[PDB]
Amino acid sequence: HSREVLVRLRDILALLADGCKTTSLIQQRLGLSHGRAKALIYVLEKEGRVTRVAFGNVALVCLSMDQYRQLVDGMIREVERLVTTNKLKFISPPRLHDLIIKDPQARKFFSSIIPIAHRTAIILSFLNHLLKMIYGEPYVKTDETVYLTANRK
Ligand SMILES: [Cl-]
C-alpha cells in the first residue's frame, strides 16, 4: 500500500486491539473523513482482519466475532450494574443514556466504543438496540421506548 494507506490500516488495527469501535469513533480518533474510514475498513474486511457487525443503525468494527461477544458481555454487565445500583423496574434509552454519562466507569467504557457525550438520535438508537437485546421487546413502544427489567433475557 501507499504510505498513507499503510499507516492508516495499521492505526485502525491498533485502535481496535483494545475493543470493538464504531466507524464514527474510528473517524474521530484518527482524524479521518467518513469516506476514508469506510474505505479503509472495507480493505481490512476484504483482508479478513476485521468484521463489521450491525448494531441497530450503527456498525461495530471488530477484530473477530469473539471480540464482539466480549464487547456485548461488557455492555450488558454495565447496563445491568446501572439497573441494579438504581433498583430500576423499567428503563428507556434516554434514562440509560443519562445513567451512563453520570457514572464515570460506564461513561469511560461506552465512550471507548461510540461517541456518547451528547444525547443524539444515533446514540438513542444504539442504546435502544442494546436494551432490546437484554430485555426483549419493549412494553411501551411509541415515543420513548420503555423496557421492563423483569423481562431480562
Ligand atoms: Cl494503496
TrEMBL record:
Residues 68-148 form the PSV transcriptional regulator domain. Disulfide bonds join C20-C62. It comes from the Viruses. SUPFAM superfamilies: Winged helix' DNA-binding domain. This is PSV transcriptional regulator domain-containing protein.
